[PDB]
Design a protein around this motif. Sequence first.
Motif, PDB file in Angstrom:
ATOM      1  N   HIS A  78      20.844  34.917  44.011  1.00 21.22           N
ATOM      2  CA  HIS A  78      21.978  34.170  43.466  1.00 21.22           C
ATOM      3  C   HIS A  78      21.840  32.647  43.529  1.00 21.22           C
ATOM      4  CE1 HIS A  78      26.127  32.890  42.862  1.00 21.22           C
ATOM      5  NE2 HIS A  78      26.401  34.088  42.346  1.00 21.22           N
ATOM      6  N   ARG A  79      21.522  32.089  44.712  1.00 25.22           N
ATOM      7  CA  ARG A  79      21.371  30.641  44.971  1.00 25.22           C
ATOM      8  C   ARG A  79      22.668  29.825  45.046  1.00 25.22           C
ATOM      9  NH1 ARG A  79      16.106  28.118  41.838  1.00 25.22           N
ATOM     10  NH2 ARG A  79      14.684  29.898  42.088  1.00 25.22           N
ATOM     11  N   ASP A  80      23.842  30.389  44.719  1.00 24.24           N
ATOM     12  CA  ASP A  80      25.084  29.615  44.720  1.00 24.24           C
ATOM     13  C   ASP A  80      26.209  30.374  45.418  1.00 24.24           C
ATOM     14  OD1 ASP A  80      24.789  26.981  43.028  1.00 24.24           O
ATOM     15  OD2 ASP A  80      23.704  28.505  41.859  1.00 24.24           O
ATOM     16  N   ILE A  81      25.933  30.923  46.612  1.00 29.91           N
ATOM     17  CA  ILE A  81      26.952  31.661  47.359  1.00 29.91           C
ATOM     18  C   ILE A  81      27.807  30.646  48.108  1.00 29.91           C
ATOM     19  CG2 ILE A  81      27.444  33.487  49.066  1.00 29.91           C
ATOM     20  CD1 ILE A  81      26.088  34.397  46.374  1.00 29.91           C
ATOM     21  N   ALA A  82      29.085  30.567  47.748  1.00 32.17           N
ATOM     22  CA  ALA A  82      30.006  29.601  48.323  1.00 32.17           C
ATOM     23  C   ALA A  82      31.410  30.035  47.953  1.00 32.17           C
ATOM     24  CB  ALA A  82      29.720  28.213  47.745  1.00 32.17           C
ATOM     25  N   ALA A  83      32.409  29.674  48.769  1.00 29.76           N
ATOM     26  CA  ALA A  83      33.802  30.065  48.510  1.00 29.76           C
ATOM     27  C   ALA A  83      34.323  29.583  47.132  1.00 29.76           C
ATOM     28  CB  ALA A  83      34.705  29.559  49.628  1.00 29.76           C
ATOM     29  N   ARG A  84      33.855  28.419  46.632  1.00 28.96           N
ATOM     30  CA  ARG A  84      34.262  27.915  45.310  1.00 28.96           C
ATOM     31  C   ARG A  84      33.888  28.872  44.145  1.00 28.96           C
ATOM     32  NH1 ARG A  84      30.487  24.000  41.805  1.00 28.96           N
ATOM     33  NH2 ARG A  84      31.471  25.509  40.383  1.00 28.96           N
ATOM     34  N   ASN A  85      32.880  29.722  44.345  1.00 27.26           N
ATOM     35  CA  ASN A  85      32.428  30.672  43.326  1.00 27.26           C
ATOM     36  C   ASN A  85      32.983  32.092  43.488  1.00 27.26           C
ATOM     37  OD1 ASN A  85      29.261  28.886  43.565  1.00 27.26           O
ATOM     38  ND2 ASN A  85      30.908  28.556  42.140  1.00 27.26           N
ATOM     39  N   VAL A  86      33.982  32.277  44.365  1.00 26.49           N
ATOM     40  CA  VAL A  86      34.601  33.585  44.592  1.00 26.49           C
ATOM     41  C   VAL A  86      35.994  33.559  43.968  1.00 26.49           C
ATOM     42  CG1 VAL A  86      35.320  35.256  46.348  1.00 26.49           C
ATOM     43  CG2 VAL A  86      33.237  33.904  46.702  1.00 26.49           C
ATOM     44  N   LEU A  87      36.370  34.638  43.276  1.00 21.99           N
ATOM     45  CA  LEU A  87      37.682  34.739  42.622  1.00 21.99           C
ATOM     46  C   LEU A  87      38.499  35.842  43.272  1.00 21.99           C
ATOM     47  CD1 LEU A  87      36.273  34.589  38.996  1.00 21.99           C
ATOM     48  CD2 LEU A  87      37.221  32.661  40.266  1.00 21.99           C
ATOM     49  N   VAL A  88      39.830  35.792  43.099  1.00 17.21           N
ATOM     50  CA  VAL A  88      40.738  36.752  43.696  1.00 17.21           C
ATOM     51  C   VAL A  88      41.355  37.590  42.586  1.00 17.21           C
ATOM     52  CG1 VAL A  88      42.643  37.028  45.337  1.00 17.21           C
ATOM     53  CG2 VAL A  88      41.136  35.013  45.488  1.00 17.21           C
ATOM     54  N   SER A  89      40.994  38.880  42.543  1.00 18.38           N
ATOM     55  CA  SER A  89      41.503  39.830  41.549  1.00 18.38           C
ATOM     56  C   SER A  89      42.903  40.303  41.967  1.00 18.38           C
ATOM     57  CB  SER A  89      40.549  41.016  41.443  1.00 18.38           C
ATOM     58  OG  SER A  89      40.836  41.843  40.332  1.00 18.38           O
ATOM     59  N   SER A  90      43.106  40.528  43.266  1.00 18.96           N
ATOM     60  CA  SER A  90      44.386  40.948  43.832  1.00 18.96           C
ATOM     61  C   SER A  90      44.378  40.619  45.328  1.00 18.96           C
ATOM     62  CB  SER A  90      44.593  42.453  43.618  1.00 18.96           C
ATOM     63  OG  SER A  90      43.717  43.231  44.419  1.00 18.96           O
ATOM     64  N   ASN A  91      45.484  40.906  46.044  1.00 18.43           N
ATOM     65  CA  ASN A  91      45.584  40.656  47.492  1.00 18.43           C
ATOM     66  C   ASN A  91      44.505  41.390  48.294  1.00 18.43           C
ATOM     67  OD1 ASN A  91      49.307  40.700  47.748  1.00 18.43           O
ATOM     68  ND2 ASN A  91      48.020  38.931  47.380  1.00 18.43           N
ATOM     69  N   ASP A  92      44.037  42.565  47.828  1.00 22.50           N
ATOM     70  CA  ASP A  92      43.009  43.352  48.523  1.00 22.50           C
ATOM     71  C   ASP A  92      41.680  43.423  47.734  1.00 22.50           C
ATOM     72  OD1 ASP A  92      43.909  45.158  46.516  1.00 22.50           O
ATOM     73  OD2 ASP A  92      43.784  46.924  47.830  1.00 22.50           O
ATOM     74  N   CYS A  93      41.400  42.453  46.827  1.00 21.10           N
ATOM     75  CA  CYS A  93      40.155  42.477  46.044  1.00 21.10           C
ATOM     76  C   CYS A  93      39.669  41.079  45.644  1.00 21.10           C
ATOM     77  CB  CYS A  93      40.297  43.379  44.821  1.00 21.10           C
ATOM     78  SG  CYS A  93      38.771  43.560  43.854  1.00 21.10           S
ATOM     79  N   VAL A  94      38.459  40.712  46.087  1.00 17.39           N
ATOM     80  CA  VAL A  94      37.812  39.458  45.706  1.00 17.39           C
ATOM     81  C   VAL A  94      36.549  39.839  44.949  1.00 17.39           C
ATOM     82  CG1 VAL A  94      38.786  38.014  47.564  1.00 17.39           C
ATOM     83  CG2 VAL A  94      36.540  39.131  47.915  1.00 17.39           C
ATOM     84  N   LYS A  95      36.079  38.952  44.065  1.00 14.99           N
ATOM     85  CA  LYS A  95      34.860  39.189  43.287  1.00 14.99           C
ATOM     86  C   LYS A  95      34.032  37.931  43.174  1.00 14.99           C
ATOM     87  CE  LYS A  95      37.210  42.670  40.487  1.00 14.99           C
ATOM     88  NZ  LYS A  95      36.935  43.773  39.529  1.00 14.99           N
ATOM     89  N   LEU A  96      32.720  38.114  43.034  1.00 16.15           N
ATOM     90  CA  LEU A  96      31.794  37.013  42.760  1.00 16.15           C
ATOM     91  C   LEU A  96      32.148  36.580  41.330  1.00 16.15           C
ATOM     92  CD1 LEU A  96      30.027  36.592  45.138  1.00 16.15           C
ATOM     93  CD2 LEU A  96      28.333  38.148  44.167  1.00 16.15           C
ATOM     94  N   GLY A  97      32.310  35.286  41.102  1.00 15.68           N
ATOM     95  CA  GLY A  97      32.612  34.751  39.782  1.00 15.68           C
ATOM     96  C   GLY A  97      31.415  34.781  38.846  1.00 15.68           C
ATOM     97  N   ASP A  98      31.592  34.257  37.627  1.00 17.79           N
ATOM     98  CA  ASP A  98      30.523  34.219  36.626  1.00 17.79           C
ATOM     99  C   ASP A  98      29.327  33.430  37.170  1.00 17.79           C
ATOM    100  OD1 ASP A  98      29.472  34.570  33.831  1.00 17.79           O
ATOM    101  OD2 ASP A  98      29.495  32.390  33.997  1.00 17.79           O
ATOM    102  N   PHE A  99      28.101  33.934  36.985  1.00 19.80           N
ATOM    103  CA  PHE A  99      26.917  33.266  37.553  1.00 19.80           C
ATOM    104  C   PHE A  99      26.611  31.946  36.856  1.00 19.80           C
ATOM    105  CE2 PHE A  99      25.150  37.668  39.105  1.00 19.80           C
ATOM    106  CZ  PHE A  99      26.221  37.787  39.950  1.00 19.80           C
ATOM    107  N   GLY A 100      26.970  31.809  35.582  1.00 23.17           N
ATOM    108  CA  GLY A 100      26.849  30.546  34.868  1.00 23.17           C
ATOM    109  C   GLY A 100      27.827  29.502  35.381  1.00 23.17           C
ATOM    110  N   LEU A 101      29.093  29.904  35.600  1.00 20.05           N
ATOM    111  CA  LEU A 101      30.106  28.996  36.140  1.00 20.05           C
ATOM    112  C   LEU A 101      29.827  28.686  37.616  1.00 20.05           C
ATOM    113  CD1 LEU A 101      33.331  30.514  34.494  1.00 20.05           C
ATOM    114  CD2 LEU A 101      32.005  28.554  33.714  1.00 20.05           C
ATOM    115  N   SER A 102      29.085  29.559  38.319  1.00 21.98           N
ATOM    116  CA  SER A 102      28.767  29.325  39.728  1.00 21.98           C
ATOM    117  C   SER A 102      27.711  28.221  39.991  1.00 21.98           C
ATOM    118  CB  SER A 102      28.353  30.628  40.408  1.00 21.98           C
ATOM    119  OG  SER A 102      29.443  31.536  40.415  1.00 21.98           O
ATOM    120  N   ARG A 103      26.916  27.807  38.978  1.00 22.78           N
ATOM    121  CA  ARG A 103      25.899  26.748  39.163  1.00 22.78           C
ATOM    122  C   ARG A 103      26.554  25.364  39.269  1.00 22.78           C
ATOM    123  NH1 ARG A 103      23.748  30.735  40.211  1.00 22.78           N
ATOM    124  NH2 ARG A 103      21.953  31.803  39.262  1.00 22.78           N
TER     125      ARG A 103
END
Length: 261
Positions: free
Chosen positions: A131-156
């Motif tokens: 990945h190379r861009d693991i950071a809290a700014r690149n994580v999104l919240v789908s719901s109170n009990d679900c987080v997801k890795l954001g788009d890899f293009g937007l994560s750079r």
Amino acid sequence: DYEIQRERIELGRCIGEGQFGDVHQGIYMSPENPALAVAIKTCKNCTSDSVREKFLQEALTMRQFDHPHIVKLIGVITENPVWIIMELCTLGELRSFLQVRKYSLDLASLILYAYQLSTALAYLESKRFVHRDIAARNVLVSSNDCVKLGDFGLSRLPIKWMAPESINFRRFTSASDVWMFGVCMWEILMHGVKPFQGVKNNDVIGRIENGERLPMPPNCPPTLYSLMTKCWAYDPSRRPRFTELKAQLSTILEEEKAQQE
Ligand SMILES: COc1cc(C(=O)N[C@H]2CC[N@H+](C)CC2)ccc1Nc1ncc(C(F)(F)F)c(Oc2cccc3c2C(=O)CC3)n1
């Protein structure tokens, strides 16, 4: 097929920016399954095919992955204005979500988010993707009990999140992503505070080489902070694997859930 007719997309408010253009939230009206909330990446310069190919390659990159904690590709509109339609994570960016809910989110929810991200990263490692861009700014919240890795293009360079070998010699492997994931776990337990605040990027390397490490977050269980410190071993071969972090985070999560019931 992934080609979407433009009349089925309603462009909503701007939710962010990427290298190619603004990112919007919107609505997608599929032929057989009504109102779906979506994220729309836009591209200001892809009247030029050189930009178009680089932009649409980002959609192809997300197309190859299928995991519950990685945002999915819905489709593309390949004629001008060129758009990429993605899944929408309605609660937005993780950093803002954790700051706003600093005093309302229980510790089990914070551990759950670290665990869910470790499943997505163990999955990407099984697909040989660094990945190379693991950071809290690149994580999104789908719901109170679900987080997801954001788009890899937007994560750079994100020096404060990088492994020493990535900073020193531009070496990028699953072991360097483990270091970054350790920093991302620290950010979650700190409620969206950035690492090394008030320190210059050029002095991060010096502090790490002197044995200094990001401190234990307030109210973080020592077993969980101890796991973060294993991600920050200077030698990449001494760091745990994502499958080991996934097993350990599950043990810490179940131990925390057992304390409630
Ligand atoms: C409602 O959904 C969202 C809302 C907001 C938001 O409130 N932003 C505010 C607006 C006002 N300004 C002043 C402050 C910020 C952010 C992200 C959302 N949801 C969401 N869902 C899906 C996607 C994806 F990946 F599929 F395209 C997506 O992408 C991003 C969008 C922004 C940043 C990143 C991404 C990445 O993928 C990595 C980093 N964002």
